[PDB]
Each structure stands twice: as C-alpha cells, then as structure tokens.
Amino acid sequence: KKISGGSVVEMQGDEMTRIIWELIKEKLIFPYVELDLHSYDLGIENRDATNDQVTKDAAEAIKKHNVGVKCATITPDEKRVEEFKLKQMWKSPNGTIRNILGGTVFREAIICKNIPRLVSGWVKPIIIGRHAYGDQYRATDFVVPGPGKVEITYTPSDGTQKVTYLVHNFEEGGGVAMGMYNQDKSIEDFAHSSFQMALSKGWPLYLSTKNTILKKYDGRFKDIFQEIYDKQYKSQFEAQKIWYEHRLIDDMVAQAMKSEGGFIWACKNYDGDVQSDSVAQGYGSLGMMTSVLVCPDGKTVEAEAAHGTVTRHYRMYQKGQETSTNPIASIFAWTRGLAHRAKLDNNKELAFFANALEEVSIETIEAGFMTKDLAACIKGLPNVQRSDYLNTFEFMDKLGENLKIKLAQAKLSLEHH
Amino acid sequence: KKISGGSVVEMQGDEMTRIIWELIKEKLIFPYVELDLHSYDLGIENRDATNDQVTKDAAEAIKKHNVGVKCATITPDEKRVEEFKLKQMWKSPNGTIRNILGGTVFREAIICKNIPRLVSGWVKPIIIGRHAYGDQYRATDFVVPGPGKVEITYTPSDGTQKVTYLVHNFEEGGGVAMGMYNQDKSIEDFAHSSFQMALSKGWPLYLSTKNTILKKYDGRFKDIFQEIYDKQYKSQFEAQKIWYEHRLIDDMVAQAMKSEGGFIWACKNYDGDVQSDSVAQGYGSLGMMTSVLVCPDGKTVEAEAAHGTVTRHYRMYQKGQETSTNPIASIFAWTRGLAHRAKLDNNKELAFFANALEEVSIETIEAGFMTKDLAACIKGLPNVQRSDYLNTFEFMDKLGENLKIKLAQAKLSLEHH
Ligand SMILES: *[C@H]1[C@H](C#N)C(=O)[C@@H](C)[C@@H]2CCc3cnc(Nc4ccccc4)nc3[C@@]12C
Ligand SMILES: *[C@H]1[C@H](C#N)C(=O)[C@@H](C)[C@@H]2CCc3cnc(Nc4ccccc4)nc3[C@@]12C
Ligand SMILES: [Ca+2]
Ligand SMILES: [Ca+2]
C-alpha cells in the first residue's frame, strides 16, 4: 500500500537536473507515495512558450497548496537567448517565485562523514537565513549612454510632496545606474523567521549588514531586527543562554571562517546567495546543500535544488555518453517539501517516509557508493577512476534498493508490535 | 647616515592603530629614513573639527605627491556620534579618498610559515583587485516613510530627453530605497589594472559579477573586461599560458574556497570588501593583509592598514593596562608606500630598506616572537599564556633590534665589496 501524500506543486527544470528529477519521481517517490501533483514545467522552452506566465502560475499554485518542490532552472544570459532563440532574456524564475511568496530561504550543508570539509574548524552546522525578497533581485538597472544626471525620487501616495536626490551627474562619458528597494513588512518577517530559527536550534543568531556605508538602507534592517529582539525574543534567547548580535558583513564572513559553526546567520538577499555557496563549498561540496523558502504565513514552503543545471553533464548525456551526477540536493528538495506536507496534514507515514529517504541518501554515500563529483571530493577529480563511482542510473538504483529495504523493514516492525 | 626618502603623505588614524602608527614612525622609520612628510590628522576628532575637510585635503595631497600611507580610522555609526558628540555622522574616509583618487585596491595575505591557514588547500596566494570607485560606496540611500512611488530617472546633458523607471510603488507601509552608479572610464581603468596584475604575476584572472540578475549594471563590467581582453591583452595572456574568465560571484566564492590559490580575482567594490576579509581570514589572520590602492595614472598609490582600530585594546590602553596588538598590517602600509616612493624616484637605498623591513617583520614572527592575537592563531585564544607573546612595546623593540641588525650587516657588506 502507498502513502497518501496530499497536494504538492512541482516545478520541472532544465538540462541534467531535469533528467534526474524524472528519475527521482520514477524510482524514489512514485513507488511509495501517491500524490495530488500540480505540475508546472519551468523548463526554459516552456517559459519561452508561455512568455514566463508558467513561472507566475506555479508561484500562485504554491500559495494555494502550501508546498512547492522545484528543480534547478536556467536563468538566461546572451548565450542562452541565442541557443534557444528566446523571445526575451527571461528573468530568474527563482527571483520571480521568491518575490511573489516572500519569506526567508534557509540553507544548510548536507553532511556525509566520509566527505571532507575544506574548513577544518567547522564541526557544527552553519544555517543561513537568506532574506528572499527585494534588493538586487527586484532592482531596476540600466546603461547610462553619456553625460547627464541620474536622480532618484520619492512621491508619497497623497501627492503632497516630492523628494529628489541626485545619484550622479555624469560629466564625461557614461556608465551604469540602478535603483533598488526593500519593504518594512518583508524585513520584519525576515527578522521573525531568523529569531524563531535560532530558538528552534538553540543556537545564537547573527545578522550581517554594511550599515556604516548604507546608513539608511542597512540601518533599517539593523533597527527592525533590534526592535523585534528587544520586544519579543530577548527573554526567550536568555532562557536558552543564546544571544542575537549584529555584525558588519566583512567582519561576519571572517568570524564565520574562524568559527566552529553552530549559529544561525541572517543574510540580506545578495549576501545569502554568495555566502551560502561559500559555506556549502566549505563543508565539502557545492551540490550538498538544502534550500527551503519559509513564507511569512507560517504555512507555505518552497524547497529547491539551489545548484546549477550541470550543463557539462547534459552535453555528455545528449551525445549518449555515460554521466555521473549527484542527485542528493534534488532528492532533499522532495524530502523537505514532503516533510512540510506531512507536518501540515499530521501525516505520520509521510513524515516517516521523508526522513527515511534522507537517511538512505546519506547512508548510501557513507557506505562508499557515490557519483563521480563526490568521489572527486575524496580523491581529487584527476585521480578518480571508473571503479570509484556509480553512473547516474546505477546510483539511483542503489538508492532505490536501500530505500525499499528501509521501508520494508519498518513495515515489518509495526505488524510485529 | 639616513636614507633620503622623499615626499610621502601620511594620514593619522584612530584608537589603538593611532598609538601603533606613532611607534612605527619613532622606532622603525625615522631612525633610518628622512622624509618630506605631509601629515594629515584623520583622527575622528580632527575630521569633526574640520567638518571632514581634512580627509579631502589628504586625498588632494596624495594626487600631488603620488604616495600616501594611511592608518586605520573609525567610520562613525550612532554609538560613535554619541561617544565623540559629532556634528554629523561622517562618511567613511576610505570611501572619500578612494572616490577622489579612483583605481583598484590590491589585497593579499601577509604569510608567516608558522601561522596556520584555515583553508588547507591554499598553497599559493590569492590576490584580490577590488574596484575602488562607486557602487555602494557612493550610493544615495533613504528610508521610505510610507506608501508612494520611488522612481529613478536619467536626463542627458543636452536636455533633449528624460527616461523614468519605476523602482517600486509602495502600496502598504514603507521601507528603504537606494540609487547607485558606476562610470565607464573607472570600469575600464579597473579592467586594465586587473589584466596588468595577472601578467605581472603570471597567474590567470577571474572577474566576478552577478550579470544574470543585474543584466545591464553587471553586464557592463563583463562587457568592458571582455572587450579590453580581446583587443589588448589576449595575446599577452596566451604567451604566458594564462587566461581570463568571467564567473558569477556565487560560483566564484565556491571556486576560490576549493582552489589551491594562485590567481588574481577582480572584484566589484562591495565584493572586494567582503571577499578580501574572507580570504585574509582563510590564510590565517584578518590583520595579516596588505592593501594598496593603485590609481589609473600609473604613478599614484595609497597604502593602508585595512583592518579595524582595535577598540578593545584601546580601552585597555586607556586604563593603563598592558596590550599586545599586531602592528604588521600598519608596518606593511609604510613599506608598500615607501617601495612605490623608491620606484618613482629610482632610489635603490629606499627600495632596499622597504623590502628589509618586510623581511624583518616576517622573520621575527617566524622566529616565534609575536603579539597575543598571532599566538592565538597557533594555540587558540583561551590557551594563550603571557609566556607565549610580547606586549606591543616589547614586540616593536624586537622588530627594531632585528631591523638595526639587518641594515647594519648590509651596510658592512658594501664597504667590503
Ligand atoms: C561530472 C562529469 C561526469 N560524469 C565529468 O566527467 C566532468 C567532465 C564534470 C565536470 C563538471 C561537473 C560539474 N558539476 C558536477 N556535479 C554536480 C555539481 C553540483 C551539483 C550537482 C552535481 N560534476 C561535474 C563533472 C565532474
Ligand atoms: C587582544 C587583547 C590583548 N592584549 C586581549 O587580551 C583580547 C581581549 C583581545 C580580543 C579582541 C582583539 C581584537 N583584535 C586583536 N588584534 C588585531 C586584530 C586585527 C588587526 C590587528 C590586531 N586582538 C584582540 C585581543 C586578542
Ligand atoms: Ca547561488
Ligand atoms: Ca573590509
């Protein structure tokens, strides 16, 4: 008998990750879980065919069903526009989804005992809470073709005043300019999510900004966090012998590098992007990271594989050549989404399944069965031999076999007791 | 006999670094070198007294004399305004100087064989070329008090057109907004400095941007670098078997973490700030880093101690307590400035002196004589005993003694040959 999984929004993606996504569903999910799956194809060709409407439709479906699982997608540049003959250079679908849902993206390494860290001191996890809204991801940027003034203005909705600031008077030649923004309510939601994560883990929290330079913009994040801490969380932190402190971003990246881990790090949108990749690589592998958007309603989540679409492997796959691609981040997008679905529905069987699949994934790699990219972490890519790893299909089949075993034994444990 | 040093602009700074700066001049520079020193006091109290004009005057003096050496300064926040009863919350003096001079700030770790790295793979140096102009450091940021529209506009100097872009329509509540810019000529100068640094070292060059998100703003940096590479440097790189490649910033920080070092990394202003601190800490210590602004004229430099003013030690010093503060980055600001002064003046004696003082500094620490902060790198701060390190004065005297020896022996080597 299969587990009744409930409603899940899935977003199909691109290139190698698109192939792996289908293998995960076929081999690891569908044989055990029956889902009311709302499928949106976010492949670059379908986003082009729908003028990117499919991306907005998927985000609206997540608001409705409360759980989304997303495959890695291409954010097209000039080369991609030429490759696919795109109508427009479509904006990041992750940016589109995040700006519709809002919230905080929590990112953490997926640790295997036999995969070495690059930062030896990191014995405890570092969890980044990346503010998912605004800043560079909803900016208006443009080329300044020549001499002239760039100004930024604010006009209150009543129409009773107008403030105009000179950004720059280009006196000789041109350049570039941009405007960006953030919202008080979004920053407040980011603060609440960060304080709640720290209390859930029993770890201290650090917020990074550059408020000495962006005195008003970054000063606002610092002020909102401090006001919310003082009024709503300080006694809770004190009860757990933890603390909250603001840090300048450049001091914070050095503090993190020198640390033993074991803290929550609240990052603005851009820093969360950069620093989560630095941290994932520091723990051993860029591809071994979870990424879950927690929305402000405290009910909606979107789990994703945050890494690239592995174009190099896709080109090999297109030529009918053997590939060996790490599917773990894509599997954990499904297990994190299904664990939330289970929490919302009080579904014990689904919660057990989601945790079991995470355990199987880690146990498989720790038993020495892994893809080429993971074998390269241990030995170095030029030293990897074909006898050191499993191809994509072989690895998925090994996970499938280990999953069947874990679930079979647990089923037998019930009937006995 | 003393070395005729020539003209140097010095900028005095704040707190503990201000005390160390005077010790360096008194013990290591003035007994050996006679300088035409143009002194500017950039202490927070003097910047307040002159309404920050001293900072602009110092930058103009560097343009005139071509060499500046700068002590670490305070960039005041709300707490500093209260502490010193400041007239205004003065902007970063580093930002003011850099935006007047322009150029690229080259940053690299100062390596000691007995100071352990936190990233074991980094066996070769990583040099960051941080674009010194514009972006967040010359931004216009403000609080949005409530609902209303933020717009950004461009008006060419002829007055024949006006382009207006909506940044955001705040429908409920307020937030923050900002405008920033960069200049084509400054980006071109940054590109030239980066390509020239890579060729000087015989190492590949990487530029990081987020052009998939800021398609026009970051796309411009990517385009200018590629055009300059193709037209002016590609054959030179090919002759040295090196290369230039653009990378997305989040991919680049992971690539750097996983690397063995040995490359030049061109960073936009904000990334150069953050990533140079991450890299300095990765090599072993935040305080062990050189930082030299190379201006576009190919004649002017400003060397600085890029770390903080060590307020914790200054508070101990104010209470008449013993302190042990690492002066190495402040010494290397002087040696890097004096080495450039020597290059401009074809002054062999000064060039020898600047290199000798760098050698003495590293040899002293490698012989096991160091400050508490460096002893903490080896043993861990809670494990450091007073028998493991020298106080500030003791360390400066040890450096002074070793410098006297190095210079005495070299003087004797001439007279013999
Ligand atoms: C994987 C590949 C195989 N099989 C190779 O033979 C190399 C050519 C190839 C280099 C580029 C590359 C990039 N990324 C991955 N794996 C990965 C990274 C991040 C997330 C998931 C997977 N693997 C490769 C290989 C090593
Ligand atoms: C230095 C100090 C001494 N002596 C102590 O006893 C500690 C209280 C103090 C903690 C804070 C601190 C910060 N920075 C430094 N050194 C430094 C850093 C960067 C550049 C130059 C110097 N040292 C301390 C000590 C360890
Ligand atoms: Ca990323
Ligand atoms: Ca810095």
**DSSP code string of B227-270:** HHIIIIIHHHHHHTT--EEEEEHHHHHHHHHHS---EEEEE-HH
- Ligand 1 site, residue A323, Cβ cutoff 6 A: yes
Nearest CA residue ID for atom 18, ligand 1: A287
The Cα diameter of chain A in Å comes to: 83
Which CATH number belongs to the domain containing residue A7 in this structure? 3.40.718.10
B292 is in an annotated binding site: no
| Chain B residue with the nearest C-alpha to that of A163 | B150
Distance CA B404, CA B401 (A): 5
CA of residue A417 relative to chain centroid, distance: 40
Cβ contact B103:B294 at 8 Å: yes
Does residue A380 sit at the B interface (CB-CB below 8 Å)? no
User: Which ligand lies nearest to the CA atom of residue A392 in the structure?
Assistant: 1
Out of A163, A175, A250, closest to residue B182 by CB: A175
| Residue B131 near ligand 2, beta carbon < 6 Å | no
Which amino acid is it at B168?
A: H
Residue A121 carries which DSSP code? T
* DSSP summary character for residue B119: B
Nearest to B211 among A77, A172, A308 (CB): A77
Q: Phi/psi at A352 (nearest 5 deg)?
A: -60, -45
Rounded CA separation B281/A139 (Å):
32
* Cβ-contact B280, B289 below 8 angstroms: yes
| Technique used | X-ray
What span, in angstroms and rounded, lies between the C-alpha atoms of A333 and A177?
Answer: 37
Place of tokens 């773990």: A328
Q: How far apart are CA A5 and CA A349, in angstroms?
A: 9
Q: In angstroms, rounded to a whole number, what is the distance separating the alpha carbons of residues A296 and A302?
A: 12
Distance in angstroms (rounded) separating the CA atoms of residues B295 and B289? 19
List B residues 87-116 in contact with A (Cβ-Cβ < 8 A): 89, 92, 95
Is A132:A100 a contact under the CB 8 Å cutoff?
no
Q: Tokens standing for B251?
A: 């991919």
Residues of B in contact with A165 (CB under 8 A): 140, 142, 179
Q: Does residue B313 line the site of ligand 2, with CB under 6 A? A: yes
Region of A15 on the Ramachandran plot (φ > 0 left; ψ -120 to 50 alpha; else beta): left
Cβ A325 under 6 angstroms from ligand 1: yes
**Distance (Å, whole) CA A4 – CA A342:** 10
Nearest to B177 by CA among A157, A186, A133, A135: A135
Residues B266 and A18: their CA atoms lie apart, in Å, by 33
Cβ pair B13, B72 in contact under 8 A:
yes
Provide the strand spans (E) within B258-319.
263-267, 289-294, 301-304
Domain count, chain B: 1
B94 is in an annotated binding site: yes
Task: Please name the residue of chain A whose CA is at the shortest distance from the CA of residue B223.
Answer: A78
Where does residue B126 rank: exposed (0-12), middle (13-18), buried (19+ CB within 10 A)? buried
Give the Å distances, CA to CA, from A226 to A189, A246, A253, A295, B98: 13, 8, 21, 21, 32
On whether the CB atoms of residues B248 and B211 are closer than 8 A, the answer is yes
Tell if the CB–CB gap between A156 and B140 is shorter than 8 Å.
Answer: no
CA distance A14 to A9: 17
A259 to chain B: closest CA residue: B118
For ligand 1, whether the C-beta of A328 sits within 6 Å is: no
Within A66-180, where are the H helices?
A: 78-84, 93-101
Residues with Cβ within 8 Å of residue B122, at least 6 apart in sequence:
B259, B260, B261, B282, B283
What is the residue type of A259?
A: S
Neighbours of B296 (CB within 10 A): 19
- CA distance readout (Å), A302 to A68, A101, A339: 4, 9, 12
Residues B101, B56: Cα–Cα separation, whole Å: 10
Contact B271, A278 (CB under 8 A): no
Indicate the SS3 state at residue A266. strand
| Inter-chain CB proximity A211 and B157 less than 8 Å | no
Q: Chain B neighbours among A 302-341 (CB < 8 Å)?
A: 308
Tell how far the Cα of B308 is from the centroid of ligand 4, in angstroms: 8
Q: Which residue shows structure tokens 């640390």? A: A259
Q: How many CB atoms lie within 10 A of CB A11?
A: 29
- Chains A, B: CB pairs < 8 Å: 275
Structure-block tokens of residue A95: 């940016």
Residues of chain B found within 8 Å of residue A227, distances taken between Cβ atoms: none
Q: Is B264 annotated as a binding residue?
A: no
CA-CA distance, B280 to B282, in Å (whole number)?
Answer: 5
Residues of B in contact with A271 (CB under 8 A): 274
Residue A209 Cβ inside 6 Å of ligand 1? The answer reads no
The single-letter code of the amino acid at B235 is: S
B385 CA from centroid of ligand 3 (Å):
43
β-strand pairing of B3-12 with B33-41: parallel
H/E element, A179: strand A175-183
CB count, 10 Å around CB of A203?
19
Q: In sequence order, which residues have a C-beta less than 8 Å from that of residue B344 and are 6 or more positions away?
A: B6, B66, B67, B299
Q: Which residues contact B181 (CB under 8 A, 6 or more apart)?
A: A144, A150, A167, A168, A170, A175, A176, A177, A178, B134, B135, B138
Per the CB < 8 A criterion, the answer to whether A350 and A6 are in contact is yes
Q: Which long-range contacts (CB under 8 A, 24 or more apart) does B156-164 make?
A: B156/A145, B156/A146, B156/A147, B156/A148, B157/A146, B157/A147, B157/A148, B157/A149, B157/A170, B158/A148, B163/A142
User: Closest by alpha carbon to A178, among A209, A220, A213, A134?
Assistant: A134
Q: How many helices (H) and strands (E) does chain B have?
A: 15, 14
Atom of ligand 1 minimally distant from the CA of A307: 20
CA distances from B176 to A157, A168, A417 (A): 16, 19, 59
CA–CA separation, B387 and B361 (whole Å): 20
* Token output for A260: 């033993």
Q: How many residues does chain B have?
A: 417
Question: What number of helices (H) and strands (E) belong to chain A?
Answer: 15, 14
B386 is in an annotated binding site: no
The CA–CA distances, whole Å, from A39 to A260, A309, A334, A382 equal 41, 19, 14, 40
Rounded to an integer, what distance in angstroms lies between the CA atom of residue B41 and that of residue B62? 14
**DSSP secondary structure code for residue A320 in this structure:** T
Dist CA A331 CA A329 (whole Å): 5
Which residues span the domain enclosing B23? 1-417
Question: Which of A289, A304, A312 to probe ligand 1 with, by most ligand atoms within 8 A of CB?
Answer: A312
Residue A55 CA to ligand 1 center (angstroms) comes to 27
Sheet holding B263-267: strands in order across? B33-41, B3-12, B67-70, B301-304, B289-294, B104-109, B126-131, B263-267, B205-209, B244-248
Which of B144, B217, B277 has its CB closest to that of A250?
Answer: B277
The answer, yes or no, to whether any atom of ligand 2 lies below 6 A from the CB of B20, is no
- Identify the nearest ligand to the CA of B95 by its number: 4
Q: Of A17, A22, A99, A100, which Cα lies nearest the Cα of A63?
A: A100
Q: Residue B135 CA to chain centroid, in angstroms? A: 17
AA letter at A85: K
Q: Is B324 in the pocket of ligand 2 (CB under 6 A)?
A: yes
Q: How far apart are CA A254 and CA A366, in angstroms?
A: 31
